Swiss-Prot record, chains A, D, F, H, J, L:
Disulfide bonds join 6-11. The chain holds residues 90 to 110 of 110 of the full protein. It comes from Homo sapiens. It comes from the Eukaryota. This is Insulin A chain. Coiled coil: none annotated. The lineage of its organism: Eukaryota, Metazoa, Chordata, Craniata, Vertebrata.
Length: 21, 30, 30, 21, 30, 21, 30, 21, 30, 21, 30, 21
């Protein structure tokens, strides 16, 4: 999920938009 | 833009930045 | 605990602390 | 809603807890 | 609520949240 | 103290109230 | 992405997230 | 400038990106 | 150093940076 | 006090330093 | 004052505190 | 640079003024 994608690994601001409503 | 490690409160501050009025859902458990 | 006055990103920080590993949803108007 | 209440007035940690998953 | 690791500036932001008007004392040295 | 209780170990919001005035 | 309303230190946090390892410059008036 | 614009009005991430090195 | 305009949790962040391992006390009115 | 001064007016780092332990 | 480790967003929040109206330049690449 | 001086190593608030404009 978000932790693995963005904290454990590395993510872009665009990937972060995957978790918007 | 860039890719960095975003963890904890920094992750949710980034979600707030990116999503803003849309809102967002922080589910660490997945 | 004391009552809170929280705007912007400070609300998301508070939700973060309050919810821990449960996570949360941030859903503003409009 | 909660987002607006905490900012225009006040809110408690107990009210915030309702938004946890 | 939950239990998490709170360190550094995050620890004092949590104390501010929890104590608010009461105030608080951050003494790392103990 | 607070660092050992809350950073090195793990603490609740209630334990954090131990350090309020 | 959504438009932003950022004051004080929140602007510097946003610049930080936006620029990543490129870094940035913060240059207020006056 | 950007510092004032983001605070008195609004600004976008794309405008902020102009201040990266 | 420059003069500061600090409200809410931003005051606690500044105290944190200023005091380091010495820690500090946060004591608002009322 | 300092909490109010830094918010309603301005304060210096040197004034803040007085609140260190 | 003190010396501590200041990293990431905490580093730029410290630069904002210290520099304020002068502004500052965050260049991690050096 | 700043990362090595202040994050990897340790720096004072005065050294941080080295990076002001
Ligand atoms: Cl604010
Ligand atoms: Cl951290
Ligand atoms: Zn942090
Ligand atoms: Zn703020």
């Amino acid at each position: 999920g978000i932790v693995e994608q963005c904290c454990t690994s590395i993510c872009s601001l665009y990937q972060l938009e995957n978790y918007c409503n | 833009f860039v890719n960095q490690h975003l963890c904890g409160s920094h992750l949710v501050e980034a979600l707030y930045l990116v999503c803003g009025e849309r809102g967002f859902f922080y589910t660490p458990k997945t």
